[PDB]
Amino acid sequence: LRPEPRLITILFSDIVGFTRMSNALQSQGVAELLNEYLGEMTRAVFENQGTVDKFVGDAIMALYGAPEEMSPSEQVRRAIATARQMLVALEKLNQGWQERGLVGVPPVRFRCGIHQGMAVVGLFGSQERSDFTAIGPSVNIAARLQEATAPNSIMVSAMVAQYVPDEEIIKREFLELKGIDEPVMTCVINPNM
Amino acid sequence: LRPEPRLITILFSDIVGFTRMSNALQSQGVAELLNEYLGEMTRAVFENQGTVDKFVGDAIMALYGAPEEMSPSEQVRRAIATARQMLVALEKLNQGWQERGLVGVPPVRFRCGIHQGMAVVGLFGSQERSDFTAIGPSVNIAARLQEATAPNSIMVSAMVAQYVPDEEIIKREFLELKGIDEPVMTCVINPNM
Ligand SMILES: Nc1ncnc2c1ncn2[C@@H]1O[C@H](CO[P@@](=O)(S)OP(=O)(O)OP(=O)(O)O)[C@@H](O)[C@H]1O
Ligand SMILES: Nc1ncnc2c1ncn2[C@@H]1O[C@H](CO[P@@](=O)(S)OP(=O)(O)OP(=O)(O)O)[C@@H](O)[C@H]1O
Ligand SMILES: [Mg+2]
Ligand SMILES: [Mg+2]
Ligand SMILES: [Mg+2]
Ligand SMILES: [Mg+2]
């Protein structure tokens, strides 16, 4: 698990307007919901051999191809499958949160950025505290894609898109992604399949 | 423990232009550096009773007042101490990275956002994968402060600032912080003491 550059697919699934919830609903609700969400999102990544890199609040950072090697295509296959499954999971999550009173508060939507690229994946931090993650623009991209894409929209990088049939690529488009000294070709892929 | 709202001080220390490194220096250098950095940053938080909530890449998210209760004042005291110590740690880190060839690549600088406020801190995620973190605008604030403040500048929220003597508050100022439906009173505090 020592940090090494690795072609991995970083999938970031951030909940759209989660702050609009961490203020709207109650703390327990925010946790219950978040945890429920992350439970299903995580489920979505793990179910897709994904690796929950970490949760950055309402954002899930899934790595594909790390720590367990995974073909770039699988990484994307999985990441996209995860992203989509997450949306499906979210479909039910909102169904339940709506029918419960946790949403209905905008029906929890999540932006998903999936990028594949060289990231230094491995354990990072002090020996006093290390977390397996991916470091590098690759990650940034995924994250920026995540935040760049519309709610319940899976925005993947050019790198990722090449694995998804054009039919599933709703719309390609370069986007000025923060931290990216170059317009990244983003392809929001079909949230379904 | 289980997620509960908690007045905690979220400290985010993100490395300024780390992507300008995850591209500049080599992977091993990026990891070696990042880990070295996070090692000292982490050190800085733990040494200040802080809690490394997680590392979000080059960003360290430290919680103060979670999971171990800590007086709001201590939280800030510690968070600020950490932020400052981090800068000091970074001072030496760059000293070494510079004298090594890892920087000199802009001398790794870090933005530090320290905010104190109600956050739902506790374990989040699925039982399949839980991470102790703080959720809620409080965190967002710290993060936005972190990214809002200039490099090697510790930007704390009004909440935090009240604990730091005005003499240490380099400059107060409200900032349109993303995700914050209200101008947050940010106070970049003296990075020294
Ligand atoms: N537990 C946590 N750990 C680390 N970073 C966190 C965090 N919680 C928040 N942040 C940081 O705070 C930032 C913004 O917080 P949101 O993303 S929770 O707010 P939003 O209403 O959901 O906004 P939208 O999803 O764009 O619609 C995150 O990107 C993190 O850097
Ligand atoms: N290991 C990781 N875990 C989670 N999120 C991560 C991540 N690495 C990156 N991100 C996400 O990618 C985003 C940007 O990546 P940078 O911060 S590494 O790039 P920069 O040049 O340092 O940017 P600047 O510090 O503003 O100058 C982060 O905010 C995370 O949401
Ligand atoms: Mg979010
Ligand atoms: Mg987020
Ligand atoms: Mg950074
Ligand atoms: Mg960061």
Neighbouring residues of B55: CB distance < 8 A, sequence distance ≥ 6: A124, A125, A131, A133, B38, B42, B61
User: Could you state, in order of their start, the residue ranges of all structural domains in chain B?
Assistant: 1-193
Q: Which residues pair with B19 in a beta bridge?
A: none
Q: Which residues contact B92 (CB under 8 A, 6 or more apart)?
A: B40
- Judged by a CB distance cut-off of 8 A, whether residue A176 touches chain B is no
What is the CB-side half-sphere exposure of residue A159 using CA atoms within 13 A?
26
Please give, one letter per residue, the 3-state secondary structure of A97-141: HHCCCCCCCCCCEEEEEEEEEEEEEEEEEECCEEEEEEECHHHHH
- Closest in A34, A124, A128 to B31, CB measured: A124
Q: Do A125 and B58 count as a contact with CB atoms less than 8 A apart?
A: no
Q: Is A53 annotated as a binding residue?
A: no
| Residue B15 labelled as part of a binding site | yes
Round to whole Å and give the CA distance between B28 and B33.
8
- Kindly determine whether residue B120 and residue A31, on different chains, have CB atoms separated by under 8 Å: yes
CA distances from B40 to B60, B68, B98 (A): 11, 21, 16
Q: How many angstroms separate the CA of residue B23 from the nearest CA in chain A? A: 7
The type of residue at B54 is: K
Q: Does A124 touch chain B (CB under 8 A)?
A: yes
- Relative to beta strand A153-157, strand A109-126 is parallel
Cβ of residue B178 lying under 6 Å from some atom of ligand 2: no
Chain breaks in chain A (C to N over 2.5 A) after: 104
CATH class of A1-193: alpha beta
Resolution in A: 2.5
Please give the full DSSP string across chain A, using - where no structure is assigned.
---EEEEEEEEEEEEETSTTTSSSS-HHHHHHHHHHHHHHHHHHHHTTT-EEEEEETTEEEEEESSSS---HHHHHHHHHHHHHHHHHHHHHHHHHHHTTTS------EEEEEEEEEEEEEEEEEETTEEEEEEESHHHHHHHHHHHHSPTTEEEEEHHHHTTS-GGGEEEEEEE--TT-SS-EEEEEEPS--
